[PDB]
């Protein structure tokens with residue numbers, strides 16, 4: 001399948017080269033997979049989700065996304081126009097308040113929630129969780145992310161936006177999950193992207209167009225935007241049977257575009273998420 005005039009990040013995910021604008025992907029499109037977006041929530045009524053999104057948990061007075069960040073990330077995972085895996089099931093877990101903020105205790109509870117709740121959902125092709133969030137190092141936050149991965153969920157986390165080594169941030173620094181840095185449309189490391197030995201992969205993160213609240217769209221930047229490209233790619237590849245939740249981060253790194261990015265510090269992987277789709 002070919003989506004013309006796609007957001008550059010989708011075109012980038014299916015290309016050996018920067019500078020193209022068509023997204024190419026197997027029409028299976030992540031059907032039969034599930035992606036949890038653990039964030040400010042998801043405006044499930046957005047026409048872009050086509051009924052494939054729903055809220056499953058909130059820790060606040062409402063399950064509504066009053067911010068937009070979670071909706072944007074969920075759109076990059078699985079919206080019809082802006083998404084990598086256009087037929088995946090999206091589940092929202094609102095651990096972040098409408099200011100984009102959340103206590104680590106709540107974030108941890110959300111991760112343990114997903115590890116259990118996947119047993120209440122039909123995901124025959126496998127389960128992914130996207131965590132476009134983080135703060136300073138916490139062994140308890142990392143532990144929660146490691147349990148979620150151990151439970152059979154492909155966990156994708158943002159490296160963080162500090163232009164610093166991700167070793168000092170959580171859940172970015174948990175080694176067993178898939179820690180995602182950000183790149184721009186000219187294959188440069190995004191200026192704010194964390195780096196370091198703990199990164200597994202880069203995805204598109206600068207000037208990423210996706211869904212927003214109020215049934216709208218906008219372009220924003222962050223490792224928060226790179227992370228759902230990887231989460232959506234994992235769900236897509238798992239539907240194809242190419243990989244599993246336990247092995248998907250390694251498979252994405254194995255099959256990545258190698259050495260394409262500029263301003264990657266010595267000791268950080270130079271690997272850009274790539275679906276290796278050939279029509």
Ligand SMILES: [Ca+2]
Pocket residue numbers: 016017018257260
């Ligand atoms: Ca290349």
Ligand SMILES: [Ca+2]
Pocket residue numbers: 174175176177178179198199200249
């Ligand atoms: Ca890792």
